[PDB]
């Protein structure tokens, strides 16, 4: 994670992130729409940070300090590079939308009016196929990854010391190995709740209401396809 | 501090997400109520014992039968939620949620929780429910269902006012500590 984006999403809401003189200029319904879009981006930033802890802190640390066999590390962190690629690209598109919407002279005041289109692109065509394929593989390997972690922690002394060392800082409190795996599995089922609530406050422009409606249907088709393609693997 | 895992289950309108948010901040959000809950590790001290209680929500997974059980591995305590303003959510407890939680979490204590107790004497709620020949769930109907499903205990709270919230999570911690 980078300081610029962490500071831009430090506040608990869009209403507390923008200047109060900018907030006063907007209707209550616009503020409600913007608060939900801000939560979607803020939680997408946290999700990409979860994936970076898995690849750079856990996976890479095990390869370079413990000299663990790549086959074992792959079993602990299935599809983390592909997941990182999908969500960093989605996040870049979300943050670019906010950046274009900024008022000149400001790094915090903005209104995002056209999210639906970005959501239709993310959850359709090649990117939707890559999310379905990647999450069907990840979620089928989820139970095996937890069992493999538990076996290593209880039998290898060097592994246990490495875990205790890298998870000691207060910024890793919610992000142990198993916690990261479940945070990733649960991410995809958060999208319909966020999109439905953005849609609830996006009736002002009929084309945006239609775009959000299509995006919601696309996300549900994705989730149904992933759910149908899962079978827990066992070692 | 020992580490324990709590999972909250129940219908989409049972108020499970709001309950996790209000407990983890010790505040009913005064500006924006978040749509989603990611996770949280609560530092709880109950009856002299210090515990790290990891909190998880199942909201959004209700229609996905193969994704939902991935939240269950190594759960130490289940909070099974229903809304007091919704007798229909109490009806889904014994034939839908209870068999699933007993299959994926055998021998794990279940606390049955009646959320939104502040709505029990709300006029709007009593008027709305009467149009479908219903009424807010009575405390004794909650106790009977808890006894029926073999729940560890029965508790009530209101995420809106915070009443009973701390008590639910402290009891859940005690239940997770038992053999
Ligand atoms: C056996 C084991 C290994 C890492 S966590 C854990 C547990 O008991 O939950
Ligand atoms: C998916 C699940 C649910 C309860 S245990 C378990 C596992 O695979 O370890």
Side-chain-side CA neighbours of B84 within 13 Å: the count stands at 22
Using a 6 Å cutoff on CB, does residue A154 contact ligand 1? yes
Contact (Cβ atoms closer than 8 angstroms) between residue B159 and residue B18: yes
Backbone angles phi, psi at B148, to 5 degrees: -55, -45
* A35/B contact by beta carbon, under 8 A: yes
3-state secondary structure A56-104: HHHHHHHHHCCCCCHHHHHHHCCCHHHHHHHHHHHHHHHHHHHHHCECC
Nominal resolution (angstroms): 1.9
In angstroms, the CA B74 to CA B48 distance is 24
E-assigned strand segments in chain B: 2-9, 40-46, 49-57, 77-83, 110-115, 153-156
* B59/A contact by beta carbon, under 8 A: yes
Q: Which helix (H) or strand (E) holds A185?
A: helix A177-187
Residues of chain B contacting A139 with CB distance shorter than 8 Å: 66-67, 70
- CA of B157, closest CA in chain A: separation in Å? 24
Give the bridge partners for A110, in sequence order: A102
What the block records as the tokens of A82 is 């592909």
In angstroms, the CA A170 to CA A9 distance is 19
Using a 6 Å cutoff on CB, does residue A150 contact ligand 1? yes
* B66/A contact by beta carbon, under 8 A: yes
- What is the distance in angstroms between the CA of the first residue and the CA of the last residue of chain A? 34
Per-residue b or e along B146-173, where b marks 16 or more CB atoms closer than 10 Å to that residue's CB: beebebbbbbbbbbbeeebbeebbbbbb
Give the bridge partners for B57, in sequence order: B8
Q: Where does residue A132 fall: left (phi above 0), alpha (psi -120 to 50 degrees), or beta otherwise? A: alpha
Select from A110, A139, A119, A154 the least CA-distant residue to A9. A110
User: Which B residues in the span 70-99 are in contact with A, Cβ-Cβ below 8 Å?
Assistant: 70-71, 73-74
Q: Which helix (H) or strand (E) holds A63?
A: helix A60-64
Contact (Cβ atoms closer than 8 angstroms) between residue B67 and residue A230: yes
For atom 8 of ligand 2, the residue with the nearest CA is A143
Binding-site residues of B for GTP, in ranges, read: 10-17, 28-35, 57-61, 115-118, 158-160
Contact (Cβ atoms closer than 8 angstroms) between residue A229 and residue A132: yes
In terms of residue numbers, what domain contains B45? 2-177
Select from A88, A34, A84 the least CA-distant residue to B32. A34
Number of domains forming the structure of chain B = 1
Q: How far is CA A86 from the centre of its chain?
A: 10
Q: How far is the CA of A150 from the centre of ligand 1 (A)?
A: 5
* B41/A contact by beta carbon, under 8 A: yes
What the block records as the tokens of A220 is 């549900």
Instruction: Considering only the beta carbons, identify the residue of B32, B60, B63 that sits closest to A35.
Output: B32
CATH for B25:
3.40.50.300
Residue bearing tokens 């909250």: B8
Q: How far is CA B136 from the centre of its chain?
A: 17
């Amino acid at each position: 994670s980078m300081e610029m984006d962490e500071k831009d999403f430090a506040a608990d809401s869009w209403s507390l992130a923008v200047d109060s003189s900018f907030l006063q200029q907007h209707k209550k319904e616009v503020m409600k729409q913007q608060d939900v879009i801000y939560e979607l981006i803020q939680t997408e930033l946290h999700h990409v940070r979860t994936l970076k802890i898995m690849t750079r802190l856990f996976r890479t640390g095990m390869l370079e300090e413990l000299h663990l066999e790549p086959g074992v590390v792959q079993g602990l962190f299935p599809c983390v590079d592909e997941l990182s690629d999908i969500h960093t690209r989605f996040l870049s598109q979300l943050l670019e939308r906010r950046r274009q919407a900024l008022c000149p002279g400001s790094t915090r005041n903005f209104v995002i009016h056209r999210l639906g289109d970005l959501l239709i692109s993310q959850f359709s065509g090649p990117s939707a196929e890559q999310m379905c394929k990647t999450y069907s593989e990840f979620c089928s390997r989820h139970s095996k990854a937890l069992k493999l972690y538990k076996e290593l922690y209880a039998r290898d002394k060097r592994f246990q010391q490495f875990i205790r060392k890298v998870t000691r800082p207060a910024v890793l409190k919610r992000h142990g190995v198993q916690e990261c795996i479940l945070l990733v599995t649960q991410r995809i089922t958060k999208y319909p709740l966020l999109i439905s609530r953005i849609l609830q406050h996006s009736h002002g422009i009929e084309e945006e209401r239609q775009d959000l409606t299509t995006a919601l249907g696309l996300v549900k088709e994705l989730l149904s396809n992933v759910d149908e393609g899962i079978y827990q693997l066992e070692k | 501090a020992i580490r324990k895992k709590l999972v909250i289950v129940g219908d989409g309108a049972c108020g499970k997400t709001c309950l996790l948010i209000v407990f983890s901040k010790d505040q009913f959000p005064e500006v924006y109520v978040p749509t989603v809950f990611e996770n949280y590790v609560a530092d709880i001290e109950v009856d002299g014992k210090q515990v790290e209680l990891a909190l998880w929500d199942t909201a959004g997974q209700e229609d996905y039968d193969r994704l939902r059980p991935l939240s269950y591995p190594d759960t130490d305590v289940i909070l099974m939620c229903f809304s007091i303003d919704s007798p229909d959510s109490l009806e889904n407890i014994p034939e839908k949620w209870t068999p699933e939680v007993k299959h994926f979490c055998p021998n794990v204590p279940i606390i049955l929780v009646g959320n939104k107790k502040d709505l029990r004497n709300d006029e709007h709620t009593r008027r709305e429910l009467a149009k479908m020949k219903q009424e807010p769930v009575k405390p004794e109907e909650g106790r009977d269902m808890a006894n029926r499903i073999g729940a560890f205990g029965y508790m009530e709270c209101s995420a809106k006012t915070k009443d009973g919230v701390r008590e639910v999570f402290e009891m859940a911690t005690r239940a997770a500590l038992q053999a």
